[model samples]
Target: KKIGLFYGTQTGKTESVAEIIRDEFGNDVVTLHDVSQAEVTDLNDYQYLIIGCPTWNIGELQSDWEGLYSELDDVDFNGKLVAYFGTGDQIGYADNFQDAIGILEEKISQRGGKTVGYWSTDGYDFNDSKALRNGKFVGLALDEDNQSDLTDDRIKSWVAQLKSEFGL
Candidate 1:
């Protein structure tokens, strides 16, 4: 199966970035799925999954992702390849920047899946973050609101990294 690019968002930054991702990763390589439409419990149907969501409520999961959030634990991810990215503002929500990304990674790890696309924290000046691990973000940490200028470059590099890890 082609990598499933699943994301939860409306006509917002998250979906916008998801579009850029699909454009970068290519439809030939990824099949886009709106998580709102995709069966939340059927994640195992795809061997590779690229999930995205935006952070809100002091690091809380986006409203769209809340329904499928806990439901993911019921899905068996054994041998599945998964990656995550989320919308956040490092300068603003520095304390909780991309907390949803960390949440997703932890659940996926517990469910028996491997994740890729760890990003460097070099360019960001966040005082702290829940998504931080060994001084790196768990996934592609995009700052659509504050760091828009660096988005294109970050997405290009991140997709390149995912392509290599996913071997697409």
Candidate 2:
């Protein structure tokens, strides 16, 4: 099945991770969508979705995703299998690390979308995070500023998990 991967970036970090995820999933299997330029209707084209964004200014959504979140309210996420990822500075914003992903996940969940690609919190050094749900991250969490060394393996692992979860 084709998957739609969406991301919005301020410093292009989120886009970089989206590219890695798309590459790992195979370009033919996953299509990338930039939230900065994409329409909400774009989500209707895929049954499986991977959404990525960053949190800024103390748990606020990235600029590109700010309006997109409300725009998504018009779409029905029912039957869509969504996976999420986010760029955050765990050390700088320890209390709110990856908060945007949790925010988006909550919106998707409220709209009847199911989520997959939950990642373990074991290796991460953070005080707290909204992304933590049920003792795990709501999705793959990446820290480009402080943990760029770990991002590659994290993306590959999440891509593999999504492959199985999406039943591809």
Candidate 3:
């Protein structure tokens, strides 16, 4: 069984997380561009599909990914397992944290895709500067202390749950 990893990143955060998942899931990783660029016709080539995209505009999907997902809406996803993940700043935008994942999950479900798991940072508090401190960022300025608190353990656990749920 093969898995496809698609990520839409404004910054590099989503791509970084996708890389982690790819390393865990092995060689079948494919970017969104890989499929769309080649004008790939079939999603049936893989058994599982994992998608990640950074949240934008307070719960809106990333601009680039929105188009790709819109096109995928017409495809059949029966029996296909899907998972989602993304990065959002709690301080910068109130709903930005989990909005992208939520939107993607809903769209995938609407197309008959089953969700393996939904990963977000809602439960984790980020009010303190120390908690929000580190991690890489692009155009937007981020609180280094607040971002650093986003631990690898949290990500690993989420990935583990996804892998288990999808029987990966």
Number of the top lDDT candidate: 2
Stretches of candidate 1 off by over 4 Å are none
**How well is each residue in 1-168 modelled by candidate 2, as lDDT tens digits?**
488988999988888778778778774888888988998888888889989988876947888888888888888999999999988888889899889999999998899899888899988888887788957999988887888898898888877888899987
lDDT of 1 by residue, 95-157 (tens): 887888788788888889887788888888777766788778888888867888999999999
Better of 1 and 2 by lDDT: 2
Looking at model 1, which ten-residue stretch has the lowest summed lDDT? 55-64
Clash pairs detected, candidate 2: none
**lDDT of candidate 3 over 1-168, digit per residue (tens):** 367776677767666666666666565544443322422234656668766666656535677676676677567788888766666666666534445666666666787988666443344544422112133111122222256564466666766776688765
Off by over 4 Å in 3: 27-42, 119-122, 126-145
Top TM-score hit: 2
Which is the winner by TM-score between candidate 2 and candidate 3?
Answer: 2
Write down the lDDT of every candidate, Cα atoms only.
Answer: 0.81, 0.87, 0.57
Please give the range of 10 consecutive residues that has the lowest summed lDDT in model 3.
Answer: 130-139
Better of 1 and 2 by TM-score: 2
Model 2 misplacement above 4 A: none
* Higher-ranked by TM-score: 1 or 3: 1
